[PDB]
């Protein structure tokens, strides 16, 4: 019954809250990858910093959904942020493969939310997803795929020299 | 039969003209609010200037529809701009409540136009509304709602000190 | 068995992981307060932004513990970040009271960790807490206490004008 | 019987002199590593310069203890600076392993000195060690550990290409 609410279905409000949680979950998974690559027995600092940046970007995605919810007159409802699926991430290839799957999971949830918004005839929510989320996902999925191709080319997981070279030439210094 | 016309339904052309009129109507209502708050026996100049700015923005919305109509090969058809519903606006709370309802009326018309454009399979018109109109409405509706909440907190309509404080701290100097 | 590990007790490593979780929990609680004050029916934007900033600072506290853990040769172990205790925060006074208690809870955990580090004769961990955490807590606790005193002076919770004045004069614009 | 002396135990004064000697010993060992990597039949100049810098930093650590001794009213007593344990350092991996052990030996001596200062209730000496020495050690130990992990990844000692790559991408140009 918010005074600002107009053309905003309860189902979409709830799905936005669930999407918010998933963004926070993604942030936390990336934070775990950062910490792993920062370990003294892993020590791939450019890879670590790549994942730290990914983590911060996911938190920005989450905060943008909070703001959106309030703009439409919905109510933010938070749930636990589940810990990541793994405590250690193997190596750069395994981590990038997990990152690819994570970004595709997030993308599928965004696409599902777009379908719901379409079904409920909510063009503002459609526009928001298209303008602020969907292209970011396609771009990041492509970037991570490109990385995986190069890690395989470099002989991961077996080729430690390849892994070193990737950290020194493929990710930001 | 315009040489530029392509995928532009007569119904959408007509609805764009009606939307243009509504934007002009909204501009005129805001102009009335400006004049009211500029009265010597009302004298809330920051509130007055807020509504003057709202009025100018609505005229910009109208002109953008005129340009759009011509870009698609439709023909601008003007009708009378009806005078506002009231000659005096009571106080800042009453005016903001009327502004909220006005912005929601405009928003509903834009949403209805988007539905029509969708029905007629006009993605250019959909994009135009989503990119140039729908988010502006959500933003302004939220801003005015926020103002109303604060005016109520400040004890409007009875609390004149509250009304003074709002004009001096909530709206641009 | 990390090659860098020296004078770092398993108990301290575990307690650092638990402290990390608590920092993340604090961040999430502050994020909830931000979202609440950003609601159209609450609409205290300077208060909202204060809590958003608090939330970001807690995430910085968490990341610093992750880095610390790795520097000492411990291993970051993550757990679920529990959702905040409340879904809505009442008003500025109730939220500030909850913030005070949260900062004191965090402070007690830091003091307990310092006691453990002292018991295990770990001066590096003692220094880290004293140089990076303990004074921040005292400062923030004092700031929030000062705010609460002023909110009470301004007649919270009943005095809406007082609450408005606080948002406009006590917290950053 | 120095006029400035206050709360400075004879045991701490003596231990500071022994610590000074150890800093000088560490400097000399690093100087030997510099000279080794500068050999025409070793020729890893970035590695050589890394160790030269390490050597200079250890001399700075020593001089700071001399100044400290005098500030407290103790008397600097010098002993021979023993030559390093080896005349040649094998390769980058062997040298980094020796550097890690050296930094941990220095760290243990600093921790032992902190324990003594604690036992003698000398908070100024505790603060000095915590503020000027202990974090430097943790940082350098982590850095060298990280290097060792990367040298192993690069196939040291057998992989000469790996050793070349490390010198060109892991240590300052
Ligand atoms: Cl609705
Ligand atoms: Cl929900
Ligand atoms: Cl996984
Ligand atoms: Cl695992
Ligand atoms: Cl996933
Ligand atoms: Cl959905
Ligand atoms: Cl995007
Ligand atoms: Cl691109
Ligand atoms: Cl690439
Ligand atoms: Cl046509
Ligand atoms: Cl018409
Ligand atoms: Cl009216
Ligand atoms: Cl009237
Ligand atoms: Cl209306
Ligand atoms: Cl229509
Ligand atoms: Cl817009
Ligand atoms: Cl906005
Ligand atoms: Cl406001
Ligand atoms: Cl240990
Ligand atoms: Cl743990
Ligand atoms: Cl609570
Ligand atoms: Cl609640
Ligand atoms: Cl608490
Ligand atoms: Cl503890
Ligand atoms: Cl601090
Ligand atoms: Cl202070
Ligand atoms: Cl204050
Ligand atoms: Cl005032
Ligand atoms: Cl003395
Ligand atoms: Cl001596
Ligand atoms: Cl040796
Ligand atoms: Cl030798
Ligand atoms: Cl040694
Ligand atoms: Cl000692
Ligand atoms: Cl230090
Ligand atoms: Cl560091
Ligand atoms: Cl490294
Ligand atoms: Fe980025
Ligand atoms: Fe995301
Ligand atoms: Fe992402
Ligand atoms: Fe990205
Ligand atoms: Fe404006
Ligand atoms: Fe308009
Ligand atoms: Fe408008
Ligand atoms: Fe506007
Ligand atoms: Fe701050
Ligand atoms: Fe904290
Ligand atoms: Fe805090
Ligand atoms: Fe703070
Ligand atoms: Fe004032
Ligand atoms: Fe240096
Ligand atoms: Fe040293
Ligand atoms: Fe050193
Ligand atoms: Fe150093
Ligand atoms: Mg209401
Ligand atoms: Mg609902
Ligand atoms: Mg979920
Ligand atoms: Mg679980
Ligand atoms: Mg569309
Ligand atoms: Mg679009
Ligand atoms: Mg785009
Ligand atoms: Mg690319
Ligand atoms: Mg013609
Ligand atoms: Mg027609
Ligand atoms: Mg009309
Ligand atoms: Mg009439
Ligand atoms: Mg837009
Ligand atoms: Mg605002
Ligand atoms: Mg090992
Ligand atoms: Mg343990
Ligand atoms: Mg806990
Ligand atoms: Mg629970
Ligand atoms: Mg301090
Ligand atoms: Mg103060
Ligand atoms: Mg004398
Ligand atoms: Mg003596
Ligand atoms: Mg000695
Ligand atoms: Mg000898
Ligand atoms: Mg320090
Ligand atoms: Mg490093």
Q: Where are the domains of chain D?
A: 1-173
Alpha carbons A20 and A22: distance in angstroms, whole number: 5
Nearest alpha-carbon partner for C108 in C126, C134, C130: C134
User: How far is Cα C2 from Cα A149, in angstroms, rounded to an integer?
Assistant: 32
Q: Please name which ligand lies nearest the alpha carbon of C140.
A: 49
Angstrom CA distances, D20 to B112, C153, D63, stand at: 82, 59, 8
Q: Give the ligand at the shortest distance from the Cα of A140.
A: 41
CA of C146 to the centre of ligand 45 (A): 37
CA atoms of A55 and A37, how far apart (whole Å)? 14
Measured CA to CA in angstroms, residue D104 lies from D86, D108, D118, D140 at distances of: 18, 6, 21, 9
DSSP annotation of C2 reads -
D172: left (phi over 0), alpha (psi -120 to 50) or beta: beta
The Cα–Cα gap between A81 and B170 comes to 36
Closest approach of A3 to chain B, Cα-based (Å): 7
Give me A103's structure tokens.
């970004």
State whether B155 and C165 contact (CB < 8 Å).
Answer: no
Please count the other Cβ atoms lying within 10 Å of the Cβ belonging to residue C7.
19
Alpha-carbon distances of C94 from B141, C152, D68, rounded to whole Å: 28, 11, 51
CA-CA distance, C73 to D144, in Å (whole number)?
13
CA distance C89 to C33: 7
Nearest to A4 by CA among C103, B28, B138: B138
Tokens representing D161 are 């290409």
| Residue C172 CB burial class (10 angstroms; 0-12, 13-18, ≥19) | exposed
| Contact status, residue B125 vs residue B117, Cβ threshold 8 Å | yes
Q: Is A58 annotated as a binding residue?
A: yes
CB C156 within 8 A of CB C92: yes
Q: In chain C, which ranges are continuous DSSP H helix?
A: 10-37, 45-72, 92-119, 123-129, 135-153, 160-169
Residue pair C8/C74 in contact by the 8 Å Cβ criterion: yes
How far are the Cα atoms of A102, B3, B120 from residue A116, in angstroms, in the given order?
Answer: 21, 39, 21
Neighbours of chain C (3+ CB pairs under 8 A): A, B, D
Residue A162 has, within 13 A of its CA and on its CB side, a CA count of: 16
Distance CA B157, CA C126 (A): 58
DSSP string, B158-171: T-HHHHHHHHHHTS
Q: Are C157 and C94 in contact (CB under 8 A)?
A: yes
Q: How far apart are CA B122 and CA B111, in angstroms?
A: 14
Q: How far apart, in whole angstroms, are the C-alpha atoms of residue A39 and residue C73?
A: 7
Which residue among D115, D130, D139 places its CB closest to the CB of C127?
A: D130
Query: Residue with structure tokens 């004191």?
Result: C104
Q: Which residues pair with A81 in a beta bridge?
A: C81
Experimental technique used to determine this entry: X-ray
DSSP code per residue over D51-91? HHHHHHHHHHHHHHHHHHHHHHT--------PPPS-S---S
- Long-range pairs for A103-111 at CB < 8 Å and ≥24 separation? A103/A26, A103/A137, A103/A140, A103/A141, A103/A144, A104/A141, A105/A22, A106/A22, A106/A23, A106/A26, A106/A137, A107/A134, A107/A137, A107/A138, A107/A141, A109/A18, A109/A19, A109/A22, A110/A19, A110/A134, A110/A137
* Alpha-carbon span A64 to A68, nearest angstrom: 6
Residues of C in contact with D122 (CB under 8 A): none
Residue C3 to residue D130, Cβ atoms within 8 A: no
Q: Are A128 and A122 in contact (CB under 8 A)?
A: no
Residue partners of A123: CB distance under 8 A and separation at least 6: A117, B111, B114, B118, B126, B129, B130, B134
The reply, when asked if residue C137 is annotated as ligand binding, is: yes
Asked whether C104 and C47 are in contact (CB, 8 A), the reply is no
CA C81 / ligand 5 centre spacing (Å): 18
Q: Which two tokens stand for residue D163?
A: 């050793």
- Alpha-carbon distance C160 to C156, whole Å? 7
Task: Give the integer Cα–Cα distance in Å for A72 and B92.
Answer: 23
Angle ∠(B29,B33,B38) on CA atoms, nearest 5? 150
Distance (Å, whole) CA C13 – CA C68: 10
Displacement of CA A16 from its chain's centroid (Å): 15
CB contact set of C125 (below 8 Å; sequence gap of 6+): C8, C12, C16, C72, C113, C114, C117
Q: Which residues of D touch A40 (CB under 8 A)?
A: 142, 145-146, 149
Distance CA C84, CA C25 (A): 7
Instruction: Name the one residue in this structure whose structure tokens are 């002109």.
Output: B63
Write out the two tokens for D54. Answer: 């390490």
Sequence-ordered alpha helix ranges (H) in chain A: 10-37, 45-72, 92-119, 123-129, 135-153, 160-169
Is D149's CB within 8 Å of A45's CB? no
Lookup: tokens for D111: 């921790």
How far is the alpha carbon of C67 from chain A, nearest alpha carbon, in Å?
A: 7
The b-or-e profile of A55-64 (16+ CB within 10 A means b, else e) is: bbbbbebbbe
**Do D141 and C4 contact (CB within 8 A), yes or no?**
yes
C56 φψ region: left (φ > 0), alpha (ψ -120 to 50), beta (else): alpha
- Rounded Cα–Cα distance for residues B53 and B172 (Å): 11
Contact in structure between A100 and A66 (CB atoms under 8 Å): no
Nearest Cα neighbor of B130 from B120, B142, B119, B118 is B118
- What is the maximum alpha-carbon separation in chain A? 61
Cα dist. D24→A45, D63, D105 in Å?
32, 9, 13
Rounded CA-CA distance A63/A66 in Å is: 5
For chain C, first and last CA: distance in Å?
51
| CB neighbours of residue A119 within 10 Å | 11
Distance CA C61, CA C19 (A): 10
Tell me the C-alpha distance between C32 and A17, whole Å: 12
The neighbouring-strand residues paired with D55 are: none
For residue C81, what are the β-bridge partners?
Answer: A81
Q: In chain B, which residues have their Cβ closer than 8 Å to the Cβ of A1?
A: none
DSSP state, B80? -
Does the annotation flag C103 for ligand binding?
Answer: yes
For residue C31, the distance in angstroms to the closest alpha carbon of chain A comes to 9
Residues forming a β-bridge with B73: none
In angstroms, what is the span from residue B95 Cα to ligand 17's centroid? 22
Q: Omega of the bond prior to D157 within 30 degrees of 0, cis? A: yes
D130/C123 touch (CB, cutoff 8 Å), yes or no: yes
Judged by DSSP in three states, C81 sits in: strand
Whether a cis peptide bond, with omega within 30° of 0, leads into A122 is no
Are the C-beta atoms of D135 and D76 separated by less than 8 Å?
Answer: no
D with B: touching (≥3 Cβ pairs within 8 Å): no
Under 8 Å between Cβ of D154 and A154: no
Which 8-state DSSP code applies to residue B55? H
C113, C85, C79: which is closest to C101 by C-alpha?
A: C85
CA distance linking residue A111 with residue D58, whole number of Å: 58
Number of neighbours of residue C13 by Cβ within 10 angstroms = 18
Among C49, C41, B133, B153, which residue's Cα sits nearest to residue A5? C41
Residues of chain C in Cβ contact (below 8 Å) with chain D:
2-4, 6-7, 70-73, 121, 123-124, 126-128, 131
CA-to-CA distance for C115 and C134, rounded, in angstroms?
13
Breaks (C-N over 2.5 A) in chain B follow: none
From the CA of D130, how far away is ligand 79's center (Å)?
7
In angstroms, what is the span from residue D67 Cα to ligand 76's centroid? 17
Instruction: Give C79's contacts in chain A (Cβ within 8 Å).
Output: 83
Indicate yes or no: CB of A4 within 8 angstroms of CB of B135.
Answer: no
Cα B35 from Cα B37, distance rounded (Å): 6
Residues with CB under 5 A from ligand 34 (ion): D 15, 112-113, 116
Annotated binding residue at D61?
A: yes
Q: What are phi and psi of A93, to 5 degrees?
A: -65, -50
Here the tokens at position D10 are: 């004879």
Enumerate the H helices of B38-156 as residue ranges.
45-72, 92-119, 123-129, 135-153
CA distances in angstroms from B48 to B28, B74, B104, listed in the order given:
14, 36, 21
**CATH architecture assignment, domain B1-173:** Up-down Bundle (1.20)
- Report the separation in Å between the CA atom of C92 and the middle of ligand 74, taken as the mean of its atom positions: 17
Q: What are phi and psi of A142, to 5 degrees?
A: -60, -45
Task: Write out the DSSP string of A124-142.
Answer: HHHHHHIIIIIHHHHHHHH
Q: Is cis: bond before D153, omega within 30 of 0? A: no
CA–centroid distance, C6 to ligand 37, in Å, is 19
Which residue in A30, A36, A34 sits closest to A83, CA to CA?
A30
Q: What's the token pair of residue C126?
A: 């003692």
How many whole angstroms separate alpha carbon D13 and alpha carbon D20? 11
If we measure between CA atoms, which residue out of D10, D22, D46, D15 comes closest to residue D137? D22
Please identify which residue in the block is written with the tokens 């070349």.
D164
Q: Which two tokens stand for residue A110?
A: 């965004």
Residue indicated by tokens 């009302």:
B42
Resolution (angstroms) stands at: 1.1
With contact defined as beta carbons under 8 Å apart, do C73 and C3 qualify?
A: yes
D50-57, Cβ contacts within 8 angstroms, sequence gap of 24 or more: D50/D171, D50/D172, D51/D95, D51/D99, D54/D30, D54/D99, D54/D140, D55/D27, D55/D28, D55/D30, D55/D31, D56/D27
């Amino acid at each position: 019954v918010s005074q600002v609410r107009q053309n905003y279905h309860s189902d979409c409000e709830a799905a936005v809250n669930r999407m918010l949680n998933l963004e926070l979950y993604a942030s936390y998974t990336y934070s775990s990858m950062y910490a792993f690559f920062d370990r003294d027995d892993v020590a791939l600092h450019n890879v670590a910093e790549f994942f730290k940046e990914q983590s911060h970007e996911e938190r920005e995605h989450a905060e943008k959904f909070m703001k959106y919810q309030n703009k439409r007159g919905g109510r933010v409802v938070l749930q636990d942020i589940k810990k990541p699926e793994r405590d250690e991430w193997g190596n750069t290839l395994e981590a990038m493969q997990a990152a690819l799957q994570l970004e595709k999971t997030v993308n599928q949830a965004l696409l599902d939310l777009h379908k719901l918004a379409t079904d409920k005839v909510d063009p503002h929510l459609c526009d928001f997803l298209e303008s602020e989320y969907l292209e970011e996902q396609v771009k990041d999925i492509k970037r991570i795929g490109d990385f995986i191709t190069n890690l395989k080319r470099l002989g991961l997981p077996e080729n430690g020299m390849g892994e070193y070279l990737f950290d020194k030439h493929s990710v930001k210094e």
